[PDB]
């Protein structure tokens, strides 16, 4: 490193040069006494939205305000105050005589985008890193509590998924498993952040693999293997068919949450799991409408 | 054999319960977190960002949903005409549903603090005009003329090198918090009205369009807070996700 351009080079400057700093805001900002302004040159009211920034105008500069000591707390708008609430993420049906899961076992690909509420909440951000608390509530379709023994198994990507109610995978030598009774309280476990990346991304603008992207393999667009945490397998523990039809509801409660890249919230009805598709002939305005702009 | 006595609330599953659950992966360590731009610590950070306020929510057909994002301003007779009107309730169905603040308020029951609406004039450089943007506190009906609207809070906006103005809707409320207003008993929580009138006129020389558009952008001030999180009702799902 002898030439002057290398000595005064900024190449390799790995430090993050951030123009902002997070400050403690435990409560709403207080208000200051302000009187009339009769002057020239300075116009707090006038802005320039072309710059792409929000208005820095305040009450004090627009009206005559009074000293208000605002002790309102900001603690309920944190990410954990907003995501540490269990919500229905999955439902699995083990009917006695049907077509969905008639053999007393079911495999559910772990995906929290099957239900509108939790999906719309999580998709407010592009990237999320969090631990989870999964609660399993099992009961008959009518809601009765019956004396049945169920096995829940987590099958990470690459482990042998059970093909039947008596497959070898149920030996769960290394796959974490929970044996529960329907008469017991709902099962509850905590899962760590298990992505190969630094965060779960609900949106992946790309293709998982290389090669030609023809019309056939278009369903792989948006598929992120970093979010494919594996499978959840539920079976009735027994060699014989169970006596009762069953339904297992999976509720997820995020905790230790971190989020990046807030994005516009969905205003169209979801159509398919893990897919931003929308009905093109049913596009609706975000809110309600009115006959005229001068009548309310 | 330590004596205990389990109390009511045993075995109940409360969805908003902060407790300790059994880990499934012992000795597991997550992938280390790299620095990612745009981390969010509080939702209020997103409430202070201005998002388009759809005052012109007349159109409904999908072919002209973009006309909903701005409202017209033209040359008038110089009679203090009314340009536009809307409600200042951020968590209420109307123009505010299109804003980020409006959608985040759907997830909370009560809100407090001052709002801000920035109006940007997107006409030609050679066009001039003065507007009167008036906030009418609760109780006062829709002003019938500019003289009545002038009695409430207001700002006179002059088009110029600064294309935008900010009407700050101050927190004028009897309660420390306001629930989301709606028709009926909860109209008690109404925030007021916002009316845009012509102050002098929309003037323009020969060779420039006779009409321009104003774009509204709503946000919350730094004294704004939300409370009592809940499930939103702005959008409801049908034809369950497949």
């Amino acid at each position, epitope marked *: 490193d002898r030439v002057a351009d290398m000595i005064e080079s900024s190449i390799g400057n790995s430090v993050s040069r951030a123009l902002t700093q997070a400050l403690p805001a435990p409560t709403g900002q207080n208000t200051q006494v302000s009187s009339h302004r009769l002057d020239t040159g300075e116009v707090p009211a006038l802005q320039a939205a072309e710059i792409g920034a929000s208005s820095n105008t305040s009450d004090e500069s627009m009206i005559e305000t009074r000293c208000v000591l605002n002790s309102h707390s900001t603690a309920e708008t944190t990410l954990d105050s907003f995501f540490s609430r269990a919500g229905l993420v999955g439902e699995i049906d083990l009917p006695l005589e049907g077509t969905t899961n008639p053999n007393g076992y079911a495999n559910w690909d772990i995906d929290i985008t099957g239900y509108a509420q939790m999906r719309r909440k999580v998709e407010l951000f592009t990237y999320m890193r969090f631990d989870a608390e999964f609660t399993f509530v099992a009961c008959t379709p009518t809601g009765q509590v019956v004396p049945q023994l169920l096995q829940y198994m987590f099958v990470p990507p690459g482990a042998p998924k059970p093909e039947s109610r008596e497959s070898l995978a149920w030996q769960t030598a290394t796959n974490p498993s929970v044996f529960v009774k329907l008469t017991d309280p709902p099962a509850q476990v905590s899962v760590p952040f298990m992505s190969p990346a630094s965060a779960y991304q609900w949106f992946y603008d790309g293709y998982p693999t290389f090669g030609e992207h023809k019309q056939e393999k278009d369903l792989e667009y948006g598929a992120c293997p970093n979010n494919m945490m594996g499978t959840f397998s539920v079976r009735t523990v027994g060699s014989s068919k169970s006596k009762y039809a069953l339904v297992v509801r999976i509720y997820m409660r995020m905790k230790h949450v971190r989020a990046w890249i807030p994005r516009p919230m969905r205003n169209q009805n979801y159509l398919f799991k893990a897919n931003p598709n929308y009905a093109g002939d049913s596009i609706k305005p975000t809110g309600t409408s009115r006959n*005229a702009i*001068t009548t309310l | 054999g330590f004596p205990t006595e389990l109390k009511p609330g045993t075995n109940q599953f409360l969805t908003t319960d902060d407790g300790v659950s059994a880990p499934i992966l012992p000795n597991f360590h997550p992938t280390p977190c790299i620095h990612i731009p745009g981390e969010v610590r509080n939702l209020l950070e997103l409430c202070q960002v201005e998002t388009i306020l759809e005052v012109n929510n007349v159109p409904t057909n999908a072919t002209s949903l973009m006309e909903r994002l701005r409202f*017209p301003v*033209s*040359a*008038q*007779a110089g*009679k203090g*005409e*009314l340009c536009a009107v809307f409600r200042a309730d951020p968590g209420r169905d109307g123009p505010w549903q299109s804003t980020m603040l409006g959608q985040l308020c759907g997830y909370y029951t009560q809100w407090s603090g001052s709002l801000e609406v920035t109006f940007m004039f997107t006409g030609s450089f050679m066009a001039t005009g003065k507007m009167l943007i008036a906030y009418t506190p609760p109780g006062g009906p829709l002003p*019938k*003329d500019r003289a009545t609207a002038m009695l409430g809070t207001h700002v006179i906006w002059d088009f110029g090198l600064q294309s935008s103005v900010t009407l700050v809707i101050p927190w004028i409320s009897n309660t420390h918090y306001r629930a989301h207003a709606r028709d009926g008993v909860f109209d008690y929580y109404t925030t007021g009205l916002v009316s845009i009138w012509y102050q002098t006129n929309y003037v323009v020389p*020969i060779g420039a369009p*006779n*009409t321009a558009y104003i774009i509204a952008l709503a946000a919350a001030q730094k004294n704004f807070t939300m409370k009592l999180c809940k499930d939103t009702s702005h959008i409801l799902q049908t034809a369950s996700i497949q």
Partner: antibody
Amino acid sequence: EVQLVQSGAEVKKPGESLKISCKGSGYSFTSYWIGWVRQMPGKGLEWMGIIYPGDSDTRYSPSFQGQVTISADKSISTAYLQWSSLKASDTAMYYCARLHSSSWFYGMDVWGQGTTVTVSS
Amino acid sequence: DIQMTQSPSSLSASVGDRVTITCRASQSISSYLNWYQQKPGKAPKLLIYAASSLQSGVPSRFSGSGSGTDFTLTISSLQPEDFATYYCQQSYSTPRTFGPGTKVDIKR
């Protein structure tokens, strides 16, 4: 619905005084100009004047100023086309209109039924 | 006073035809020409305002163009209900003169 209803068919004599009324319903009244249009039998439309009821402000056509008086009672929301001395050349259809809500430069956007005035001896 | 004129004084066409009429102003009203349609024994009906803006509730086949002193109304496909008298008025000045009128009749 926004609408304008006029007095009705009127028959008079050449030299009396007439006052054709027109009431607007479905909208405000002290916010929009109204104005009147004359159509002689077999002829086209002829602009007479415009009245802004709130703070009554009347603009007249030069060919009609001094022959008719346009007024407006905002209390009842009714415009008037008072005549002082009818002439034989006043036989025509008179329409009360309402200028465009978006701007008074955008023409007469609402129209009444029309009143047929016939003055003859 | 601004004098308005229309051309042709009266034209004829059949269904599906492309009708076009011109309105000329003595002065230079910028874009404040209004086109009205009136049928026999009926009140005038505003078709176009601002010389190009289509009034709500008017079929898309009507098109206004022009500015200054020359304006044009065009019917892309003439329909049976489009056989009426079309007037152009200027809203720029006072008095707001109406055009002499152009009558469209079925041709044979």
